[model samples]
Target chain A: GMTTFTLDERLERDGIPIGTLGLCQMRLMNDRRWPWLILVPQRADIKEVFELTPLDQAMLTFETNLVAAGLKKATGAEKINIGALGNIVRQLHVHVIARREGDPNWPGPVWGFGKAEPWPEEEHRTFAARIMENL
Target chain B: MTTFTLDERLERDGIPIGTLGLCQMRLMNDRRWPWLILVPQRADIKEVFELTPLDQAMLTFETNLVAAGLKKATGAEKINIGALGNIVRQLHVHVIARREGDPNWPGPVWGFGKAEPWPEEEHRTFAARIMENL
Candidate 1:
């Protein structure tokens, strides 16, 4: 019940509001450096994807594809690596990282490698606005 | 070419001899611990699953399932599992594991943690026997 409620001011203030999809959400997270949006599937207390209601599940899957497409279109990078490795965050989320040969850890796993770069304000605005328009 | 060759004795000494599958390996990696195995699919010049070309993918997937099934058969806690392409001098890699709450936490159960001490012959023989069965 609590999960279904929209992101309150806390999430919005701490994150970037990229607008909402059907049953899931799109929020550009705290770090502005890298293009990261925590696509939380607006379901409370859920730790796994399967925990979503059937209708929400369908909607969430659709939203996930849209988010992936949006991220790819926004970033224009090669090879979008889709992973659901939630070691740190218990919340159910999928990461769709746009990879390029030049990015810091070109041929390595991104974890434990380097400090996260916050996206620049101007670039973030442009990227998010473009993505929102497409969405 | 060389990748398809079976794992030799070095891996045998370091790991528990589990079972073998198509195009590669089986070894219990350190500490009788719970059940665990290192499966290097016999494919050279490959890191990603996408690199497998075609037939090997089916074989590799089947082997992964077998490893998972074997882990399930042996009263597994949870399959402490991974396919590490890190520091990959050679291409193929996997670490399939069975767990109990009594054992390690994060795993592919590497050497960073202190290994549980146990009698040599007892666990070794157990490993050999399990390897045979698996």
Candidate 2:
């Protein structure tokens, strides 16, 4: 028997599917203000990075770096913010956002800053294409 | 033969802040806030989970060790732990100490506000205490 991973409705609605990397599904966060990418491990019932098998955990790390590098090359951001807080979405996912000085939420967390500025369809598509090509 | 290389990025971007059981600790440049990062000198790793199971376990052990050490060193109201490799694509862990009403309070400390560099003497003395706690 084979099992497949399911995306949280909240996540699916909020992110644009970028593709998959190793053991994780990649998504470009819909927020237009920052170049944000999310990595959700395709494992069933895991909430923390540590819960995965050590091998899977290592893979996740490798995948995360790939996405992070893609975002950096695409955006030339000053910094990259990464976090995994299972406070709301219990399913394990990691966030990697490209940051710059004086952005909308400069010097602050991207969450709860304001409503997500959804990316334009063409822009999102182009960015995804770039990320996939580099990734 | 070299089994592991200490990342030049760690020392170039950070100060020799402290050390834990499995990591060479470094303090972030921001002095207005308290932040620390752990770089496992295990050679070319960019993620905490990439280490061996024993090494991974040791990382967790030391993550806790560093977290507690930061809590004591800063007496922060909250602690944020993360491992992200977007920009400086390398394996490292960050343990950030946050206080209520701090510049980036309630939000994250990533890009918020300018980093105020700590005086050399102050950093050395404080780093000594943090390493002691670990």
Candidate 3:
């Protein structure tokens, strides 16, 4: 029997749904400080990348590259920071954050940073559409 | 023909722990956390997307293998994985084992606090333990 995937509550509250990729649910982190995206594989009860099968693991890499490239192109970011830390939120979520030379929390991990300033709904939709175009 | 060389900074900070197929596994010198780094032995590569498709798949395989092994060896509560080549652009992946109430709980280990170097015998034993799990 196949299991149904549910988005974690914290992720649902903090992230704005961007769209779905081949193997993951793409979401834009609500914090407008930096251009950040989260990729959550739509697999139920999975908490680590290692838990996925080899084929799914390969697919994750493919989708991650696609999203990261689009993000870099859309924002012209100097660097891309990728991480999978499930300390606070037990569900597996990969963070693909686009960083600039002197953006907020520059040269440092963005987790546990300052408050997340939610983007205005109009601007949020506009930005999400822009990111989707490159995908 | 290009040959892979360990980046100087990575070499300085990590102790060699042998290779796993596509990546050269190294135990980070920091004793404060159970940290390991996997550097795919491809010359002049800085990003995950830069690797060939086959190599990219292999990198993921090696990362998953090590992450699981580290979890078993340390019994860590959570595993944190990342690849941020902002400063060291040699394309290395960090696999760190985290537990509740760690020094920087819920926060990242990068640039948080001073690293405590592992003692000679302790690191040797720990490295051997990790290798056994692999």
Candidate 4:
């Protein structure tokens, strides 16, 4: 689990574009098997959310909308579950996950479920492109 | 299970008053065992949220804001737990209620429990006052 803490590594390793709003980046994790997007506010070393300035908070709202849209569109999902429980990463990032009825972890919160699918070429490329057009 | 059909008796005869800026109306649920408010936009007799998913989306946004609006005023913790599962009737509605550590429990507090009916008129005046303030 080489948690990408650095921005450049996060963008490159996670397939996020620098040209896009850096408020949040799509980070694919291992195990859950559902479309998941991790949105980092890029506060640099800040560990929690309330530490963000009001301006950053406003940007967070904007990115959250985009993040939700991306997850929903990418998966054609019903629920776009959102949460910010950073017990592991310890970084101030929110999780926007797509949920379906007959999928893995059905009717349960996704956590402690083994690991998510890891990839050399993440599907975020097309997903991000699609969301970019909409956003 | 008092089925709240049209605009359940929430503010004025335990029912709410005139609408405001396309937002929410703060009403005292008599079951102050939980500070709950019922939100309905003047968008006709349509029921359910997934129906429009558009202008109603913006108003839903506003009412949700006003929700965190009143509960935060209760000097309570974590504002109110917001939910809009309108299974009871066909009227579009949002329910915002204050919850706490050991709240009027069941780890929950939906009806089916004894509701502390508040003074019919006083609560409306006070809660309606909250609506005005908002």
Q: Which portions of model 2 miss their true places by more than 4 Å?
A: A1-3, B1-18, B25-80, B83-92, B96-134
Better of 2 and 3 by DockQ: 3
Docking class of 4: incorrect
**In candidate 3, which residue pairs clash?**
none
Two-way TM-score contest, 2 vs 3, winner: 3
Candidate 1 ranges with C-alpha deviation above 4 Å: A2-15, A30-34, B1-134
Binned by DockQ into CAPRI classes (incorrect, acceptable, medium, high), candidate 3 is medium
Residues A17-87, candidate 4: write the lDDT tens digits. 42336566556543337666667776677554445655566566557656666657767876665554443
lDDT of 1 by residue, A68-90 (tens): 56676778755444333333354
Please rank every candidate by DockQ, starting with the best: 3, 2, 1, 4
What stretches of model 3 exceed 4 Å from their correct place? A1-3
Question: Per-residue alpha-carbon lDDT of model 2 for A1-135, expressed as tens digits?
Answer: 013688888889988998877798889889998888899999988765656776676677667666766777778776677776444566788888888778876666676678888999999999999888766
DockQ agreement of candidate 4 with the native complex: 0.06
- Residue pairs of candidate 2 with colliding backbone atoms: A107-B111, A107-B112, A107-B113, A108-B112, A109-B108, B46-B91
Q: Record all residue pairs in model 1 with backbone atoms less than 3 Å apart, i.e. clashing.
A: A3-A44, A32-A118, A32-A119, A33-A117, A33-A118, A33-A119, B15-B28, B16-B28
Candidate 3 residue lDDT tens string, A1-135: 124788999999999998988779999999999888999998888888999888888899888878888888898888788899999888888999888778887787788888988889998899999999977
Q: Which is better, 1 or 4, measured by TM-score?
A: 1
Candidate 3 residue A125 C-alpha distance from true site, Å: 1.3
True lDDT of residue A73, candidate 2: 76
Error of 2 at B31 (Å): 16
Fnat for each model: 0.02, 0.26, 0.74, 0.00
Worst 10 residues of 2 chain A by lDDT: A81-90
Per-residue lDDT tens digits of candidate 2, residues B80-131? 6676544455668877777777775666666666778889899988888787
For all candidates in order, the CA lDDT equals: 0.51, 0.74, 0.89, 0.50
Per-residue CA lDDT of candidate 1, range B70-90, in tens?
A: 454565443432333333334
